[PDB]
Amino acid sequence: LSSVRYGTVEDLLAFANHISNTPQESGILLNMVITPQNGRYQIDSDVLLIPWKLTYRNIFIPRGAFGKVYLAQDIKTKKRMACKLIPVDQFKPSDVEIQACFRHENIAELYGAVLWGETVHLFMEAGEGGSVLEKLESCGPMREFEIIWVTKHVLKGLDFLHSKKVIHHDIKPSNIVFMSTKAVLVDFGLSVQMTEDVYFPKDLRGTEIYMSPEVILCRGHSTKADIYSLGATLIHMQTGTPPWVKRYPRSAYPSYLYIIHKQAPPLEDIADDCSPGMRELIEASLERNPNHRPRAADLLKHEALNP
Ligand SMILES: Nc1nnc(-c2c[nH]c3ncc(-c4c[nH]c5ccccc45)cc23)o1
C-alpha cells in the first residue's frame, strides 16, 4: 500500500498489523466522509486540523492512552472528525480493531487510518461537546438526571462490548464523550478480545483511580473490570471529585495500588446528597468480588435508570 484509498475492514486490519510489525502518506478509508485526492490525504490541503471549541466559561487538546486527539475537517465534505495522532512505536492494533470490527451507537465510529512519517492518524466520530471530565472540571458535580442519561449510554456500549468478549480496560470520565444526542465510549488502545472466560494480563493496564482490585492483583480478570471502573466513574460524576483523592491525596507517593487493594470498594466516597436508587447502583457496580458484581445488562434493569 503506497496511497490513501477507500477499502474494507480486512484492508484496514492488514494495514494496521503491518505498521505495528514495522515517503508519501498511505492508508485505508472506511467512510466517504473523508475525501482522498489522487490517492493523497494531506494536512492543510485535503484536511484541516481545527481547534476544539468547548463552550464552558470557567475553563485544549485531550490526551488518549497512546496519542493526542485533535479536531479535523474534511475540505470536500466539511465533515468534522476526531483525529488521534499516535507515534508508530506506541501503536497498538486494538486502537483500530474494535471500532473497525464492531459497530454500535455508543461506540465511536472509525472513519479511516492514515500513516505519515512515524505517526498514525486515526479519523473517528467527533465528540464536539467534549468529555465527562471537562463537564465535571467546569460545572462541578453532575445532577442525577445527567448521571442517569450518561450511565444509560455507557451501559449500552459496555453491554454490547462485553457481549463480544471485549474488555475496554480504561472506563473513566475522559473516555466518555458528548455528541449531539448521545454519550459515546472512546479509546480502545488498552482494550482486549477475550478468548477464554478469564483474561490473564501481561502488564498492568488502566487508570489507577478507576482500577478494580482484581486488575491490580494481575492474577486474571474479565469484563467485570469495566463495571467497577464505571462505579468509580459514577462516584466522580456524583461528587465532582474522583474516589480516593479526598481521603488519600498523593504527594510523596503517587501510587494508589496499595490503598485500592487494601481498601476497595471506595464506598465512603459516595456523597450524602446521593439518592437511595443511585447509591444501590454505585454500591453494586463497586462490589469487591467480580463474581458477585453485576453485568452491564443487569445494571440496565436497575430502578435508578428506569421510570
Ligand atoms: N482518547 C481518545 N481516543 N479516541 C478519542 C476520541 C474520538 N472521538 C473523540 N471526540 C472527542 C474527544 C474528547 C475528549 N476530551 C475532549 C475535550 C474537548 C473536546 C473533545 C474531547 C475524544 C475523542 O479520544
Which cell numbers in the block locate residue 148? 442517569
Three-state secondary structure call for residue 183: strand
Which position has the grid cell 498523593? Answer: 250
Helices (H) and strands (E) in the chain, counts: 9, 11
Is residue 188 exposed (0-12), middle (13-18) or buried (19+ Cβ within 10 Å)?
Answer: buried
**Residue 170 annotated as catalytic:** yes
Q: Give the domain ranges of the chain.
A: 1-128, 129-307
127 CA from centroid of ligand 1 (Å): 6
Experimental method reported for this structure: X-ray
**CA angle at residue 137 from 136 to 138, to 5 degrees?**
95
Integer CA distances (angstroms), 98 to 104, 156, 247, 286, 295, in order: 11, 16, 37, 26, 20
Strands 26-29 and 4-6: parallel
Nearest Cα residue to 46 out of 108, 98, 138, 116: 116
Instruction: Give, using CA atoms, the residue closest to atom 8 of ligand 1.
Output: 126
**CATH classification of 129-307 is 3.40.50.300, yes or no?**
no
**Residues 108/123, Cβ–Cβ less than 8 Å:** no
Ligand 1 mutation target, pool 177, 187, 188, most atoms within 8 A of CB: 177
Intrachain domains 1-128 and 129-307 with the same fold: no
Stated in angstroms to one decimal place, the resolution of this structure is 2.3
For the Cβ of 184 lying below 6 angstroms from any atom of ligand 1, the answer is no
Name the class of domain 1-128: alpha beta
Catalytic one of 46, 95, 170, 187? 170
Rg, the chain, Cα only? 20
For the Cβ of 124 lying below 6 angstroms from any atom of ligand 1, the answer is yes
CA dihedral 3, 8, 13, 16 (to 10 degrees): 20
**Residues 183/106, Cβ–Cβ less than 8 Å:** yes
